[PDB]
Amino acid sequence: MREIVHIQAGQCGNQIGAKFWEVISDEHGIDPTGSYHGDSDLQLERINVYYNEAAGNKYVPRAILVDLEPGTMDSVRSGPFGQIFRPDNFVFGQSGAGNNWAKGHYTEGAELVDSVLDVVRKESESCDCLQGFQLTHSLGGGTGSGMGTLLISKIREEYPDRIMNTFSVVPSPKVSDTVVEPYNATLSVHQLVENTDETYCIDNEALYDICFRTLKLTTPTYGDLNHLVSATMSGVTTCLRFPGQLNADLRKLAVNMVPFPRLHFFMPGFAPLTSRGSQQYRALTVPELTQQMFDAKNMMAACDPRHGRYLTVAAVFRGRMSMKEVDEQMLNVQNKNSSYFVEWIPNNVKTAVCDIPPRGLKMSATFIGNSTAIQELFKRISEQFTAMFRRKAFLHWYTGEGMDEMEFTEAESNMNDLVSEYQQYQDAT
Template sequence: VGVAFWEKIIQEHGITPEGLYTGNNPQQIERANVYFTEAQGGRYVPRVIACDLEPGVLDTIRQSKFGGLFRPDSMINAASGAGNNWAKGFYTEGAELLDQVLDTIRQDVERCDLLSGFQLCHSIAGGTGSGMGSLMLQKVREEYPDRMMSTFTVVPAANSSDAVVEPYNSVLSIHHLIENSDMTFCLDNQALGNICLNVMKKPLPTLGDLNSLVANVMSGVTTSLRFPGQLNADLRKLAVNMVPFPRLHFLMSGFAPLTSTQVQSYRHVTVPDLCQQIYSTNNMMVDVDPRHGRYLTCAAMFRGKVSVKECEDTIWNYAEKNASSFVEWIPNSTQIAVCDIPAIDSKLSATFLGNNTAIQETFNRVGEQFSKLFRRKAFLHWFTDEG
C-alpha cells in the first residue's frame, strides 16, 4: 500500500523514478518538501521509513522501478519474519529492530523545519503490521506526544483470511490504535475487491488494483498538505473537525469518480455526481454499511477546477436532504477542502472521510471471531510463549 501511495504522489509532483523533477507546473514542486527531502543535484528523496521482519517485500521494492528513489538506510528489515504472531512483532523480533527504526526516525525528524506528524501504513491481520505497528505507535507517541499520528489500517475482511490467528492480532492492535492514534483510516480488502468488481467492472482484481484504490484515498487525504489550494485542511485541522471524542477516531473513506474504463470517456463528471458517489455505500473502502449508523462528522476534499461555493452548496443540500443520516447535536458537521491541482487520471475528483457509528460493525465482527477462539484458548500458546 505504501509503495502504491509513493508511486502516485511521485507522478503528481512530476518527479521521475530517479528523483528528478520534470514537471511543467511550479505548483507541483512548491510544497514537495512536505514529503520529500531535496538532496544533492536537485534529487528528491521520499521521507519514508519502510520496515519489515522479513526481507522478501523490501527486496521486491528495492528491485522495482522506484527502488532507486528510496534511501537504502530507510529500508530496515530482519530476516526471520513474525510468523503471523502479534507477540513476535511486539515483544521479540520487532523489539530488536526498534532502536534502529527509532534512530532513523530521529534523524529524519531533525532534518525537518516543522514536523506536522506521522503516517503509518500497516495491516492488523499479520504479525509485523499488527505487533511491530503497535510497538512503533506506542514508542513514537512517547517520543513525540504533541505531533499528529494518523494511520492507514487494513483491517481483516469478513469472508477472506490469510491467517487463522487474525482475530487475536487485530484485537491486540486495536487497543493500541485506540490509545495512541489520532486518526485511523480503516480499509479492508473485501470492500476494495467489491469496488473493483462491481463499480470498476474488473472481473479478476489483483492486489495492485486494490492498492491503487487505497493510494487514491491516501493521495486525496494528503492533497492539502502537498499543494496550495483555495480551502486547505492539514492533518491537525482535519482531526480537529473529524474527531468529536478522542477514542472515536476510526474513519471510513471513499473516493470518486470510480467507473469502469470503458465508460470513462463517455462521462462528464460534475460536483453533484461526485457528491452522490462519495456518500454511496458502493464506494466505501471498508466493508460497512453507513446506513446502519449515523455520521458524526464528514470531510469532503475536492480536486480540480471547481468553485468552492458549488462544492459547499452541493454538500449542504445533501446533508439537509439526508438529515436523518447525521447526528443532530453536531450542526454543519461536514468539512470541505478544495485543491486546484487535479489528480493524474481525472480532471475532477473527490475524497470522502466519514466518522460513522456503523464502523462498530468491523470491531464487532473481529470481537466475535476473537471470542470464539479465546473461549477455547485455541492457538494461545504461540502468544504466551513469546511473553
C-alpha cells in the first residue's frame, strides 16, 4: 500500500503527469477495464495496492486531473484509459493558473481546496498511510507553477508527516517562450523549494536536446519525452514498490541522499541513458548502464558532471545484478574521479536491485546526484529575471497577482544564498 497520490497539473503536466499516470497504468498492464489484465500476481498486488479496486476489480488510479482549462482534462479523458479513472476521482478548476504562478496561485486556490479536500480525504482513507505524493506540472509554465505554489503549501501542510516529492519541468534556460513565463515559475519554484521536501526537475531544453539528439528524430515529441520522463519515474515506483533482491526504502534512501536533511533536494537522473538509436538498438552490459549514467549525457538535465558535484549518486538497478557486477560498477565510480566521488563519504553511491527486471530491458538504473552547473544556471535565469526587473515589465500584472516585490526579491535572495552553496557542492568532491 502506502499509495502516493499522483497529480497532473499545469498544461505541461496536464500532459506530462497524465502521461506518467497513464504509462504507469500501462505498467500496470491492467486492462482498461481496471481489472488486471496482467497475469502477474506480483504486479497485480503492487498495482492493486496502488489503485483502489473498483467493483469489477477496476483499478482506481491515484491521480487528480487539473486543468489549466477544462478542455485539457477533456483531452485527457478523451485520451486513453479515460475509463480507468472514475470521473469522480478527478476534478479540475476551469480557470487553472492561467499560466500565472501568482495569478493562478490566488485564483486556483479556492478551487484547489475543494478539489484537494475531497480527493485527499478519499486518498487518506484509501491507504493507511501514503508514502507521499507526487506532483506533475510545469513550474516553468505559468500554471504548474501557479497551481503548485498554492497547492504545495497546504498540501504539504496537511501532513508534515508525509514526505512529498514534486515534479515540474524547469523552463529551458536556452530559450523561453516569454521572459515572463519562467518568471511565473521562478517565484513558484522559489517558494516551492523550501515548501517541498523533494523536488525533481529536468531542464526542458536539455531533455529536448538529448531526447531529440538521441532520437535523431526531427524533434522530440512532447508526449514522448513525457513518456520518457514518466518511464523514469515509473521505475522508481515500480522498483521500490516491487520486491527487490536489494530494495531500499524511500525513507532511508531519501534521508541518505542528503548527507543530512538540510539538503533540500537532489536532482533526478535516469538510466540507462542512451541515444534513441543507441539505446534502442543497443543492449546494456552490466557495466554499460553505469557508464552511460556516469557521462554527462546521462543526466536528463544538461550539466557537466565535473561542473556539478554529486552529493551522492544513487542508482536503482532493476533485476538481479551479479555481485561482481556490483563490484565493478562501484569500483569504477570511485576510480573515475576523486572529485566526482565525495571525498567525505566513501560508498557515496548506494544501489538497490529490483527483484524483477523492468518490463523491457533486464537492467535499469536511476541516477541520483545534483548538477552544480544546472542549479547555478537556473539562478542565472533569476538574474535574467532581475534584469527584467530593471525593465520592471508587468509589475502591474504581478500587482494583480498580488505578490509583493519583496517576495520576488527574497525569492531570488534565498535562491542566491542557496546557489552559492550549489557551487560549493561542486567544490566539495
